[PDB]
Amino acid sequence: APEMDQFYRSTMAIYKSIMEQFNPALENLVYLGNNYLRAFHALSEAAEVYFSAIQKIGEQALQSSTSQILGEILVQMSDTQRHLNSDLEVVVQTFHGDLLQHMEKNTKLDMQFIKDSCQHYEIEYRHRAANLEKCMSELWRMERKRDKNAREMKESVNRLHAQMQAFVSESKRAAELEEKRRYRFLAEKHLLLSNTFLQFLGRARGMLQNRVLLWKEQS
Amino acid sequence: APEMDQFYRSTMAIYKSIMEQFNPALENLVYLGNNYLRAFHALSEAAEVYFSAIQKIGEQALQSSTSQILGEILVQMSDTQRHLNSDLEVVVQTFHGDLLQHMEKNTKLDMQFIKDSCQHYEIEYRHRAANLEKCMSELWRMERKRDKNAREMKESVNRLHAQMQAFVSESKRAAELEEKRRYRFLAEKHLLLSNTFLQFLGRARGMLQNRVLLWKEQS
Numbered sequence: 425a426p427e428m429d430q431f432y433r434s435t436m437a438i439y440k441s442i443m444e445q446f447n448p449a450l451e452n453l454v455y456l457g458n459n460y461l462r463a464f465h466a467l468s469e470a471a472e473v474y475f476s477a478i479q480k481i482g483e484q485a486l487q488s489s490t491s492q493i494l495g496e497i498l499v500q501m502s503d504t505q506r507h508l509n510s511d512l513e514v515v516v517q518t519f520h521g522d523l524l525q526h527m528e529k530n531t532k533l534d535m536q537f538i539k540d541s542c543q544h545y546e547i548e549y550r551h552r553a554a555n556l557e558k559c560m561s562e563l564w565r566m567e568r569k570r571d572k573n574a575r576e577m578k579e580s581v582n583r584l585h586a587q588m589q590a591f592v593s594e595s596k597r598a599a600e601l602e603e604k605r606r607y608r609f610l611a612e613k614h615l616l617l618s619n620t621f622l623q624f625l626g627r628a629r630g631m632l633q634n635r636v637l638l639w640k641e642q643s
Numbered sequence: 644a645p646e647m648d649q650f651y652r653s654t655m656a657i658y659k660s661i662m663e664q665f666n667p668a669l670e671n672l673v674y675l676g677n678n679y680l681r682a683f684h685a686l687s688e689a690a691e692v693y694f695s696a697i698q699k700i701g702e703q704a705l706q707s708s709t710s711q712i713l714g715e716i717l718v719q720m721s722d723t724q725r726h727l728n729s730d731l732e733v734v735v736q737t738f739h740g741d742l743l744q745h746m747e748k749n750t751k752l753d754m755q756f757i758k759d760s761c762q763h764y765e766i767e768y769r770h771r772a773a774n775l776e777k778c779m780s781e782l783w784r785m786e787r788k789r790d791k792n793a794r795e796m797k798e799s800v801n802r803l804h805a806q807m808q809a810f811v812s813e814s815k816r817a818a819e820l821e822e823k824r825r826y827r828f829l830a831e832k833h834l835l836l837s838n839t840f841l842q843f844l845g846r847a848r849g850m851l852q853n854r855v856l857l858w859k860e861q862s
Contacts (some may be wrong), residue, residue: 463689494826607713629844
């Protein structure tokens with residue numbers, strides 16, 4: 425009995441961690457996440473305006489009489505930045521489409537899921553608890569009543585308590601699992617982001633290893 | 644002779660362009676430079692806040708019964724973003740310090756230099772043009788007086804006209820050299836920025852590709 429309100433409490437602490445700790449944190453990450461995107465979109469703009477202006481300076485040098493080659497270099501620096509940005513707004517779109525639209529689209533759908541799960545558990549615990557402790561009393565009083573049929577009632581109670589041990593034990597494991605599944609999903613989505621961004625790193629590094637060589641002006 | 648005039652107007656057109664076109668383009672470039680810097684430090688701040696939250700979640704998983712490994716990963720993911728941001732803000736300060744600040748002064752000290760080079764050329768052109776007229780005048784006078792020595796005056800005028808052709812060619816090649824030095828500065832600075840950013844791309848790849856393999860196996 426004492427050990428069982430323990431399971432009950434421990435299982436409840438987990439559903440409550442999910443509902444009022446984890447779930448809200450996902451709304452938050454969608455909030456902070458959207459701010460993150462807007463900063464990204466602002467950086468890419470400031471870059472495009474900056475390099476568009478380098479392109480113009482470059483276009484002037486192309487027109488000149490001795491700075492044609494320097495002219496070519498500046499124009500292809502802006503072109504490069506334009507490319508790296510195309511590459512980067514891919515990672516930014518993975519972040520948006522694959523991660524940020526996912527959480528806001530499902531966050532309440534999964535709140536309600538765990539809410540029903542938690543309710544199902546509580547309600548079944550209450551019943552077993554009730555049907556059990558009442559059977560104990562039947563046994564408890566057809567006990568002093570020196571009833572012969574107290575033996576079928578002793579086994580009816582003992583199996584009822586075994587089933588509750590099973591259920592309570594299984595619920596705690598299933599609730600732990602759900603918690604882990606949600607951490608794992610957060611970790612996995614961020615692993616995909618880390619991976620796309622790693623890919624961008626290799627591409628950008630790819631073109632800069634040669635650009636830096638082509639833009640030297642001698643030796 | 645007015646083809647020497649056409650040299651004169653081009654040699655001035657070059658100095659005046661550096662001063663009236665190029666340098667106000669660089670001042671604009673400094674502004675867009677700092678706007679760019681501004682959007683980066685904001686992205687940094689957004690990303691920083693976002694992954695500070697990711698890490699909190701990791702710290703909550705670190706205190707669960709079965710999600711400690713996933714929680715360690717999430718925290719390792721924040722620590723990684725933080726390291727990368729730190730490493731990149733370093734490249735960004737190269738931008739501000741090695742480029743933007745240096746342009747600032749160049750676009751200030753330069754205007755005085757170009758003013759002094761225009762004036763200097765104007766003074767030297769006119770002194771040579773005046774002395775040429777003065778010798779042509781002395782020639783035509785001898786030619787009136789039937790002076791036998793106009794033979795050694797026309798010879799001199801020829802020498803002077805020649806030295807004037809040389810001065811007019813040199814001064815223009817010197818103007819074109821000045822205009823090109825300034826494009827060269829723009830290009831050298833951004834090549835340096837490019838190499839600094841390339842070194843970072845390597846460091847970022849190196850650190851991230853290792854983490855991603857681990858995270859993949861652990862989750």
